[PDB]
Amino acid sequence: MKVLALRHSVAQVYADTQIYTHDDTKDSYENAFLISNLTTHNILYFNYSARTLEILNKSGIAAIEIQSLEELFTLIRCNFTYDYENNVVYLHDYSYYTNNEIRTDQHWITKTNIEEYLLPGWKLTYVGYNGNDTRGHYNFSFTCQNAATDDDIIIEYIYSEALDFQNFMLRKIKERMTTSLPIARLSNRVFRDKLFPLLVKKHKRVVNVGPRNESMFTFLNFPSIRQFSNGPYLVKNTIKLKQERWLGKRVSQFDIGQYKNMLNVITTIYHYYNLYQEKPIIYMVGSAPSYWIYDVRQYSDFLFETWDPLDTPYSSIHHKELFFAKDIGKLKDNSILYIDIRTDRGNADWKEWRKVVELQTISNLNLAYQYLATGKSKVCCVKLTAMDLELPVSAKLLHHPTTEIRSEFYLLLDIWDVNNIKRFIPKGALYSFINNVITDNVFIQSPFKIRTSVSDYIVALYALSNDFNNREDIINLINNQKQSLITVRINNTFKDEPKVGFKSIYDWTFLPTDFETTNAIVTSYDGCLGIFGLSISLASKPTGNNHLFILNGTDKYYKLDQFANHTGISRRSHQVRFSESATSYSGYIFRDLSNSNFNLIGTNVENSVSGHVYNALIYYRYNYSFDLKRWIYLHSVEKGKYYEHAPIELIYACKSAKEFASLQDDLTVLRYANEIENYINKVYSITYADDPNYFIGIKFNNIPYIYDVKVPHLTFGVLYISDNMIPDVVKIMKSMKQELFGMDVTTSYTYMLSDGVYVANVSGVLATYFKMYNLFYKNQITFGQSRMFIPHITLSFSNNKTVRIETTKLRIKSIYLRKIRGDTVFDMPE
């Protein structure tokens, strides 16, 4: 929501688009609330309270100080992710195209002949992970960098098997200008990099479910984490494959053999991590260029040993420029070995070269076998070619994207693999694997069993909510797990559809009430981002791939007003109320008509009994960052910290939301409202004195209207009690005697309350009524009725016309407790 606070003295004015202006010196939390309810994208903050900036940032709303209006202000007309703890700004902005450049996260790409295939004059410039090397471009009051890169395009080109790069880059850039900004993808890079270190330091055992190739670099420094992904391609599974012949498909114009090498070595690193939770020694044979080491070293320090006749720049120690044949004993006991040996494309016939390469393949495989036969705790990966050969059945198969699909694959072998059953594999099956399979993911770990773990911190970022996963197992995991961070699809669909999908790929959808979590925060990406110290320029759109984030066993659950608060609950409510609606009063109007309070709708903008629940039910697709359930619960057990609202006040908003949904045919909001009302009636064991025996009544000295009944009284309470509780009731009355006479009782008009009932309004007594309802309910005394409480002084049982007077205070003369249908009053304090 991009709130920018600039100095009041330097309150510069320009007509920027979608801007707003706010400033006030009354409270520090309500300035944040009122800012959170502004309707535009950018907000300009002029009294610039540091406290209020911190509150916004905790809520996920980006709030930063602006000191160099000349450049700081103008260079923030784009979205960004703000690390407010370290005061860092990560710009997600593709204006750098005006420099005729493509930006990448990876250094190795700069060494390929990629620039030739770009548009004429274009270059690609390395920017570092999340634009770390761009900090020179921006020298502001804060550290500033541009996290936007074109790496998605390059990776898509590599996996797309289409050849011509010029048109591909051009098409993808034009598309990027035609579609809205990929905020989720770009800010999640920052969130991953900040999140997982905090978890590894802060928690004993961290389990990450379904990592994707995007974060392959994130976990390079954290072997403590146990990863669960899709299964690996085993050799035994090649029995199903139909035999095929050589097929020379070219996928990339520029040589990407280094990307293949890097994905291979990283896959091996993570296999080793999965087996032994420690960082291994890396041994590499071949891999002469080896530039990508740099990109790995940016995330974790590793010890690299290289054997290649050419030079390898970034290696730790290039043990020998000479080739490696029988030097097995140099290899230490806790390590991984990458064997990429290609002798040479000789200038001989292709058949002769094939025999040469086949013999070389057998040599490499035997080298791997000797590597793993001698020593415990090691893993290896070999380059083989497609031929008839006998591989172990449990070995893992790798074919990552390479420049051309030309009869090569890789075999990943642990020590359990070497002495295992070996099977004969024809060249046709291996060719079928090379041609029909491209390895999608470097995480080859066994799938995650969706069971609650008591010693683990489970992290399911975008993996659990899928069409094929068991829904009830997901619900039980979220419900009963301690210490977790799990994400599901939101079900922002009308008609309450239980799945949502794109081109026959579907996801399960959940409402916040579909869970029964005891102690957890159920918020948006904004809320979860704030809980971990980040804020963002751009909120979730109501219709999109929006996810609920659920944090189980968090430090922050009891900080109700601090994290996943009601910031922005009324942003959409206010936009609709002031632009499109029939009247700005429509809300109070509808809420009173929904609770059968139509008897008078006269100036109901004052002292309405409905609550936050109405906007959390109706506009949930916008403000689901609120966590309505925790808000209700924490106010059940004070341990009402700011509000002290009676439960009937919550139930009334529930009923109003149900009627609204039925009018709009919003089936989802109808369910959500019914379920929240159920949760309320579970947390509060509410009772209704629909058949009362006694009542509390207030009597006034003067009555500014013509009255036709003998006794004008305000029925201020109605209750159902046994006689023995009359002292208890009395005590509770005494408990607020001061407060009872303190209230500023006012009346301004008379109206018809029902057929044959003519009453005078009473104002200013309702807050006291709710405090007293809370006290009676806490004391297990049945107080209140099924209907809504309407404070009124009955004037006559006749049908008379409405009369108005100026606000005339009313004065209390006695506050009595009387038995219904008994002329006997059982208490009369003055």
Distance CA 364, CA 381 (A): 10
691 binds a second copy (CB under 8 A): yes
∠ at Cα 277 (274, 283), nearest 5°? 80
504 binds a second copy (CB under 8 A): yes
Distance CA 760, CA 756 (A): 14
Binding-site members for GMP are 574, 577, 588, 591, 608, 612, 615, 645
Classify residue 443 by burial, with Cβ atoms within 10 Å: 0-12, 13-18, 19+: buried
- Give the binding range for a second copy (CB under 8 A) out of 113-121, 123-131, 304-312, 420-428: 420-428
* Secondary structure (3-state) at 13: coil
Binding mask 596-635 for a second copy (x = CB under 8 A): x-x-------------------------------------
Shortest Å, Cβ 618 to ligand 5GP: 8
278 contact partners, CB below 8 Å, separation of at least 6: 223, 334
612 binds ligand 5GP (CB under 6 A): yes
Nearest 10 degrees: Cα torsion 45, 50, 51, 55: 60
Binding mask 786-805 for a second copy (x = CB under 8 A): xx------------------
- Joined together, the tokens standing for residue 244 give 């095929």
- Interface with ligand 5GP: number of residues (CB under 6 A): 11
Pair 627, 560: CB distance under 8 Å? no
Shortest Å, Cβ 618 to a second copy: 18
Shortest Å, Cβ 236 to a second copy: 6
- Give the binding range for ligand 5GP (CB under 6 A) out of 128-136, 275-283, 290-298, 570-578: 570-578
Member of 134, 258, 570, 625 binding ligand 5GP (CB under 6 A): 570
Member of 15, 177, 317, 421 binding a second copy (CB under 8 A): 421
Q: For 327-360, what is the HEC assignment? A: CHHHCCCCEEEEEECCCCCCCCCHHHHHHHHHHH
Pair 569, 623: CB distance under 8 Å? yes
Shortest Å, Cβ 803 to a second copy: 22
Listed by the residue before each break, gaps in the chain with C–N over 2.5 Å are 639
What are the catalytic residues?
713, 715, 792, 794
Q: For helices 647-664 and 586-594, give the axis angle rounded to 10 degrees.
A: 100
Member of 579, 754, 807, 824 binding a second copy (CB under 8 A): 754
Pair 515, 550: CB distance under 8 Å? yes
Member of 610, 656, 668, 715 binding ligand 5GP (CB under 6 A): 610
Member of 385, 565, 608, 623 binding ligand 5GP (CB under 6 A): 608
Shortest Å, Cβ 686 to ligand 5GP: 18
- Joined together, the tokens standing for residue 489 give 């699809």
496 binds, options ligand 5GP, a second copy, none, Cβ within 5 to 8 A by partner type: a second copy
573 contact partners, CB below 8 Å, separation of at least 6: 37, 587, 615, 618, 619
Distance CA 375, CA 301 (A): 24
206 contact partners, CB below 8 Å, separation of at least 6: 196, 199, 200, 222, 224, 225, 226, 456, 457, 459
Member of 286, 611, 647, 697 binding ligand 5GP (CB under 6 A): 611
Member of 286, 587, 717, 791 binding ligand 5GP (CB under 6 A): 587
Residue 64 or 235 with smaller CB distance to a second copy = 235
647 binds ligand 5GP (CB under 6 A): no
587 binds, options a second copy, ligand 5GP, none, Cβ within 5 to 8 A by partner type: ligand 5GP
577 binds, options a second copy, ligand 5GP, none, Cβ within 5 to 8 A by partner type: ligand 5GP
Binding site for ligand 5GP (CB under 6 A): 570, 573-574, 577, 587, 608-612, 615
Binding site for a second copy (CB under 8 A): 236, 239-240, 242-243, 245, 393, 421, 423, 426, 428, 467, 472, 495-499, 501, 504, 506, 596, 598, 665, 667, 690-691, 754-755, 785-787
